[PDB]
Design a protein around this nucleic acid. Structure first.
Ligand SMILES: Nc1nc2c(ncn2[C@@H]2O[C@H](COP(=O)(O)OP(=O)(O)OP(=O)(O)O)[C@@H](O)[C@H]2O)c(=O)[nH]1
Ligand SMILES: [Mg+2]
Lengths: 103, 87, 14, 368, 283, 14, 360, 46, 49
RNA sequence: GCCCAUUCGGGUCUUGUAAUUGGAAUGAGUACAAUGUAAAUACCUUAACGAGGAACAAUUGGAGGGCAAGUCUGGUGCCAGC
């Protein structure tokens, strides 16, 4: 997906769907990221709207594949990756407040 | 001193908005304002906005009456109107 | 609607 | 020669050009057309004018840096004073005029004297729009229009923030507390830093009230700066029915006059049952009473609701801490929290009696 | 091993930012010793400067800049432990933080508050230093609390930061073996450029005076907003040399500069090799 | 005067 | 508090650089020793345009009208419209908006309404083909001047939709240490409310002057028919010379008036263009102001741009004096190390500019 | 008068927003699901 | 609950009738109204039949 | 209460409860020692104290709800959706 690696590091451009009027919609929890290896711009999810305010811009994100287990309902098929870290800190730990995001 | 009179005017606005914070609300910030919990007709002087059901009835103006007027001028000039036909 | 979110204004004293 | 002539600013610009050898007019100065015709009848004067990604970004920025060095290698008072000036590691003396008396009087060398250079933005004041968060280890929730000391850039300053929400991105309407475990927006009158800068916020900075808990209260970043914000606080107008028919009702007291109802005609109301409705016309003799039409028959035990929005203002309050101008340099006291003011002047906290929840038990619902 | 090579070569990639720190004469790296009131600090700053410059610097005050390498020199200062304000300022300008932890008592809210203020204002390098290792006869509980402090420190800094263990104080200051390899840890730290610091010209003031006029004070009578010279090294971006540059002195207010005379370096680094004891200077 | 840490900062079960 | 200027020269550049720098200025003695002293209506409406574009900026005109106080504010942009007076065309108001244009909260979508052209101002084709490419390679990528209708003087009645929609942080640092090779030379000959043969007469005059240089000449032709023509007869011609390997351009325009021969105007604009090529090096004599303004509000690095000897003038150095008067920066003119010509390379270290109005 | 103006500006705002959101949804669908299917197509050869 | 907090899916409690308006007992809410309305609608449906 | 089953339904049986309550147990810990050993650590042996939220406070991941005078979207009332 990323070539030969399992994850890939990337640079957050801008939170896509920031004007979506529906909380936790797949358009809303959807981030555009420039991968640092080959320079190309891809689009990645994030776990929810609640963890959407941990990424802001040029954040040194780390992103893995998504792995849909079945045709979802409010999906947008055509986004492959999910954000799994931000600035070297796991944002699931950030979301449950186990760590604090350093800058 | 200079910092002394800066500090006392700071302390002045400290005092006035700390007893704004303790003191009684404005009615207009509080929700569930009834009739008996307001200044009587503070609402004409309010400039308050809200929403409405439907677009109200159109006030007929000179420009819209000349709009459908030269519309039917065009229509009955070229005679492209629609009636019934005999069987 | 033009006034609604302004904060400046020219001050014409002429 | 020419740079010294340009920046020697007691001589006229035409005198600079004269001893070397106006912008409302956009197009520049040309000759006469006849002189230009005899000049450009020939053409041969200007016939020779006529005819991995990460390492790539690092290479571009190091290319710019070596361009910086090899173009700095120039005149010594040009580089070392005026074209860049005092790079880093330069030991300087720096003189400030009109420093307060209290600094020199109470200068205790334990407390560090830090100085930082403000940008063009950070000397401007106005509303800063942040998104913030109650810090996960701070115990108590935060309240709007309670002061907290922010550490925003170089400055530490006590301000009055007001926490907002863009409820499904429609308004930016006003909360009364920060949320328990997530981010809200906020807006405070303070010095306008740039966007995307982070900050902390503290309830209490002194040591007499330092207690046992965690002292840093808020964290956040700055989203936007502006000179004005337009935020709202919902007000509903409640009125009750007193004469009900099928599909229409006469509503008693949300207005005081038929002028007020005339101002509000056609507005959509609803009962607490979610029955939508619309106000139609003010009744004549009872003054604030009007006629509304609903989706179906409302009951005598209902309350109608006109959801409106009232604008609310941030409070232009700003005092920087100035802890180094004190004789103690801890024990800085600013505006107090609202519970501290109530505890001081012994006012009981405001309790609406019909705002308190109860244990509702449904009766069984049987119809005829 | 090819998948290993890809997944390891991936984590060399980071966000490419500018540096804005010079390579010819960089400023002395600001080392801030941060502790709750009653542990290390003074004794620790004294021991480090005595090992570094062969000079018993009893009764410290203010920032202390010494030369500790052939090209790395660094500035020692100590926060007053009760002031959250000074805690906040040195969190915003420090480069290295020696985080004092009373290992017998455990973690504490002053060091936790510094860690969070630094984490939000641009987390510098942090070397944790745990003192008071005089727990009991129980070397078992010494090792247990040692491991627990290391893990709790690793959840606050990156997983693999350095927690250092100091033994008991012997003759006024710490054991010089422990301070020797502590300075060995400080000497290799490989600082990475921050953001606010590298778009802002700042300066920690190691010398202060008022160049006012005492007979003008005799005329007006001590109410005078008086002029002040502030001497020190400056970091970050190049501060411009024209008068009128606006400046926040963090704790007294906002001013604008009047005149800058740059001075020759009072603590300079000299031009495989080793550092001469002649050239181990102190300012 | 020792502001000891407490259980939620100590064990960090967020 | 206020940086003080004197006289009503460079008025738009002073208000523009005060808006960029965020510094309160006063401009004193606006033509005070004159029969009708004070500010004129076109610069008063320019102040109204500044109040439209920014937000929280307070402008304070005096009683006599001969001194103005500009305390600037945040550039916010938005969509607007500007009914500028007959004293100046739309180019007089869209030229100083191209500086403020990429540094706002919301993107510039303004439409100006008035006279299109003037002898002593910028035209639509001037603004577009000359001044948009230097911004296009200084960092913006989406900028467009649309003509919806155009109006020749004196009655005018033409509307111009300026839309910039790349809100950059700061312009990039320029590095033009060369003289760009001119690849082509194109243009546009326009005419409103007159016969369509005048455009071909203008094109034939310009190309018969241009025919002896061994490049390629191409002039496009537009007559304006209908309501898009405006309320007055007019015609004019604008040539550009195009360096295509980098994107540079050098332009020259004019317009005809009552009694003007179109072959005369075509050959005049052709010879004026060739003289701009002669007196030009990597910029034009009129593209040079915003070029060095974007170089001075770039990053905190060194940006260098080649200029020639004849581009130095009283206008250029009064620009440099106003730049140093507002935000205290100097240009360093170092000469090139080859001597068949006199070209300096102006290196400017840009101030540390970012746009802080765009929400993150 | 304020009724008619407020209603029609709210309708315009909603009809703009729906177009904008549908545009960004199916541009993310088309010009990234083409790459998803291209990666699946060149992963099926392995 | 895949990415939801239990402090987020809390229980919002419902409000009672105002004590001034208390003789008209039990301010009815949307579940009470739908119990009213679908009863009325089924009885009107059989009356129409 | 539990089990089966696409459906209607069928099969089965002492099963539950932030209900009260009772005295026993000891282990992590805190610690006398002696042994060990050049000496000290550790193992081994070992008196004293050490449990009720036995708070002396193990996690991680998954499945599903339910709620408001709340908010948003659609449109053939009271609905559908998020
Ligand atoms: N037992 C023991 N005592 C120590 C140790 N380190 C410091 N101390 C004692 O700590 C006492 C308090 O003085 P300092 O340590 O200088 O205090 P500080 O850490 O600078 O903190 P402040 O008092 O707030 O300035 C000293 O008299 C030392 O004896 C250590 O490792 N072990
Ligand atoms: Mg000390």
């Amino acid at each position: 997906p990323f070539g030969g690696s399992s994850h890939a590091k990337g640079i957050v451009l801008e939170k896509l769907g920031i004007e979506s009027k529906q909380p936790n919609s797949a358009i809303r929890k959807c981030v555009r990221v420039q991968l640092i290896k080959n320079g190309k711009k891809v689009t990645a999810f994030v776990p929810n709207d609640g963890c959407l305010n941990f990424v802001d811009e040029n954040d040194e994100v780390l992103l893995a594949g998504f792995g849909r287990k079945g045709k979802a309902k409010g999906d947008i098929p055509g986004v492959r990756f999910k954000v799994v870290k931000v600035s070297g800190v796991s944002l699931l730990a950030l979301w449950k407040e186990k760590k604090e995001k350093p800058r | 001193s200079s910092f002394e009179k800066q500090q006392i005017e700071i302390r002045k606005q400290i005092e006035q908005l700390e007893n704004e914070a303790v003191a009684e609300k404005k009615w207009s910030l509080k929700g569930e304002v009834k009739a008996k919990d307001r200044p009587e007709d503070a609402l004409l002087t309010e400039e308050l906005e809200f929403d409405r059901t439907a677009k109200p009835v159109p006030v007929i103006t000179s420009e819209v009456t000349e709009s459908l007027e030269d519309m039917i001028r065009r229509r009955i000039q070229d005679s492209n109107f629609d009636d019934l036909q005999r069987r | 609607k033009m006034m609604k979110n302004k904060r400046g204004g020219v001050i014409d004293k002429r | 020669n020419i740079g010294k002539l340009i920046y020697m600013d007691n001589i006229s610009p035409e005198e600079c050009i004269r001893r070397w050898r106006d912008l409302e007019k956009f197009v520049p100065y040309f000759d006469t057309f006849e002189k230009l015709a005899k000049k450009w009848k020939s053409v041969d004067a200007i016939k020779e004018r006529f005819l991995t990604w990460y390492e790539l970004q690092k290479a571009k920025i190091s290319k710019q840096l070596e361009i910086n060095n090899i173009e700095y290698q120039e005149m010594t008072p040009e580089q070392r004073q005026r074209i860049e000036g005092f790079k880093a590691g330069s030991y300087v003396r720096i003189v400030f005029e009109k420093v307060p008396m209290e600094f020199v009087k109470n200068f205790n060398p334990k407390f560090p004297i830090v100085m930082g250079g403000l940008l063009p933005t950070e000397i401007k004041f106005g509303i800063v729009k942040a998104r913030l968060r109650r810090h996960r280890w701070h115990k108590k929730i935060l309240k709007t229009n309670d002061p907290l000391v922010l550490s925003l850039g170089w400055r530490r300053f006590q301000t009055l923030p007001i926490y907002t929400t863009t409820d499904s991105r429609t308004r930016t309407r006003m909360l009364k507390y920060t949320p328990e475990h997530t981010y809200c927006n906020a807006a405070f009158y303070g010095p306008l830093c740039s966007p995307n800068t982070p900050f902390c916020g503290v309830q209490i900075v002194a040591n007499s009230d330092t207690g046992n808990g965690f002292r840093i209260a808020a964290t956040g970043i700055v989203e936007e700066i502006d000179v004005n914000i337009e935020i709202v606080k919902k007000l509903k107008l409640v009125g009750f029915p007193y004469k009900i028919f099928k599909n229409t009702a006469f509503i008693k007291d949300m207005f005081s006059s038929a002028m007020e109802v005339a101002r509000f005609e056609g507005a959509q109301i609803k009962t607490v049952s979610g029955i939508r409705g619309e106000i139609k016309r003010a009744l004549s003799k009872p003054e604030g009473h009007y006629r509304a039409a609903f989706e179906d028959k409302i009951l005598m035990s209902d309350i109608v609701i006109l959801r409106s929005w009232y604008p609310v203002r941030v409070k232009k309050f700003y005092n920087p801490v100035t802890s180094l101008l004190l004789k103690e340099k801890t024990e800085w006291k600013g505006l107090r929290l609202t519970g501290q003011i109530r505890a001081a002047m012994n006012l009981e906290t405001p309790s609406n009696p019909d705002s308190a929840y109860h244990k509702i038990e449904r009766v069984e619902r049987h119809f005829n | 091993t090819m998948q290993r090579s890809s997944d390891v070569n991936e984590r060399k990639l980071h966000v490419p930012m500018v540096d804005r720190t010079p390579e010819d004469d960089p400023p002395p790296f600001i080392v801030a010793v941060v502790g709750p009131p009653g542990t290390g600090k003074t004794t620790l700053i004294r021991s480090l400067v005595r090992r570094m410059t062969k000079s018993t610097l009893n009764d410290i005050q203010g920032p202390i800049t010494v030369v500790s390498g052939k090209h790395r020199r660094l500035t020692f200062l100590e926060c007053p432990a009760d002031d959250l304000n000074a805690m906040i300022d040195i969190a915003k300008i420090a480069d290295l933080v020696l985080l004092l932890i009373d290992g017998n008592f455990g973690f504490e809210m002053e060091t936790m508050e510094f860690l969070n203020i630094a984490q939000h204002h641009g987390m510098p390098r942090v070397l944790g230093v745990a003192t008071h290792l005089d727990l009991f006869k129980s070397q078992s509980t010494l090792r247990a609390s040692k491991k627990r402090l290391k893990h709790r420190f690793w959840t606050e800094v990156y997983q693999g930061a350095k927690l250092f263990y100091l033994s008991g104080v012997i003759n006024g200051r710490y054991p010089d073996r422990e301070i020797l390899n502590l300075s060995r840890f400080i000497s290799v730290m490989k600082f990475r450029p921050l953001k606010w610091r590298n778009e802002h010209p700042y300066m920690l003031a190691d010398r202060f005076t008022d160049l006012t006029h005492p007979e003008l004070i005799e005329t007006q009578g001590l109410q005078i907003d008086r002029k002040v010279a502030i001497y020190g090294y400056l970091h970050g971006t190049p501060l411009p040399s024209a008068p009128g540059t606006r400046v926040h002195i963090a704790g007294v207010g906002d001013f604008s500069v009047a005149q800058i005379e740059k001075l020759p370096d009072p603590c300079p680094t000299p031009f495989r090799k080793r550092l001469d004891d002649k050239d181990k200077l102190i300012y | 005067g020792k502001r000891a840490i407490n259980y939620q900062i100590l064990k960090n079960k967020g | 508090k206020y940086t003080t200027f004197q006289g009503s020269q460079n008025f738009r550049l002073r208000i523009v650089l005060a808006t960029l720098s965020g510094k309160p200025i006063k401009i004193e003695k606006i033509r005070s020793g004159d029969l009708n002293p004070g500010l004129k209506d076109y610069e008063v409406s320019f102040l109204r345009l500044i109040e439209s574009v920014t937000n929280g900026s307070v402008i304070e005109i005096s009683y006599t009208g001969t001194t103005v106080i500009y305390r600037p504010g945040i550039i916010v942009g938005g969509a607007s419209t500007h009914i500028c007076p007959s004293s100046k065309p739309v180019g007089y108001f869209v030229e100083p908006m191209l500086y403020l244009a990429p540094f706002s909260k919301k993107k510039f979508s303004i439409l100006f309404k008035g006279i299109t052209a003037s002898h002593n101002d910028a035209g639509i084709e001037a603004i577009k083909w000359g001044l948009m490419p230097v911004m296009e390679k200084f960092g913006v990528r989406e900028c467009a001047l649309h003509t919806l209708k155009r109006g020749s003087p004196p009655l005018g009645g033409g509307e111009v939709h300026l839309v910039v929609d790349s809100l950059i942080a700061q312009p990039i640092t320029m590095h033009e240490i060369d003289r760009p090779i001119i690849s082509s030379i194109t243009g546009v000959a326009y005419s409103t409310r007159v016969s369509p043969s005048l455009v071909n007469r203008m094109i034939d005059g310009a190309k018969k002057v241009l025919k002896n240089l061994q490049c390629e000449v191409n002039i496009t032709a537009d007559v304006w028919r209908g309501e898009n023509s405006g309320k007055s007869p007019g015609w004019g011609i604008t040539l550009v010379a195009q360096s295509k390997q980098k994107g540079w351009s050098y332009f020259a325009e004019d317009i005809g008036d009552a009694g003007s021969i179109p072959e005369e105007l075509g050959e005049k604009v052709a010879c004026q263009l060739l003289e701009e090529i002669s007196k030009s090096a990597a910029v034009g004599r009129n593209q040079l102001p915003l070029a060095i303004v974007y170089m001075v509000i770039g990053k905190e690095d060194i940006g260098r741009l080649r200029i020639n000897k004849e581009q130095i003038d009283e206008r250029f150095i009064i620009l440099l004096r106003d730049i140093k008067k507002i935000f205290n920066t100097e240009v360093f003119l170092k000469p090139v190390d080859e001597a068949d010509n006199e070209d300096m390379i102006a290196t400017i270290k840009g101030i540390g500019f970012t746009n802080t109005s765009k929400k993150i | 008068f304020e009724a008619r103006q407020r209603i029609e500006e709210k309708n315009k705002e909603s009809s703009d927003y729906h177009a904008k959101m549908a545009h960004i949804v199916n541009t993310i669908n088309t010009e990234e699901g083409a790459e998803k299917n291209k990666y699946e197509r060149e992963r099926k050869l392995r | 609950a895949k990415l939801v907090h239990d402090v987020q899916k809390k229980q919002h409690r419902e409000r009672s009738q105002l004590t001034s308006r208390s003789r008209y007992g039990f301010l009815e809410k949307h579940k009470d109204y739908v119990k009213r309305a679908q009863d009325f609608h089924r009885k009107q449906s059989t009356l129409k039949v």
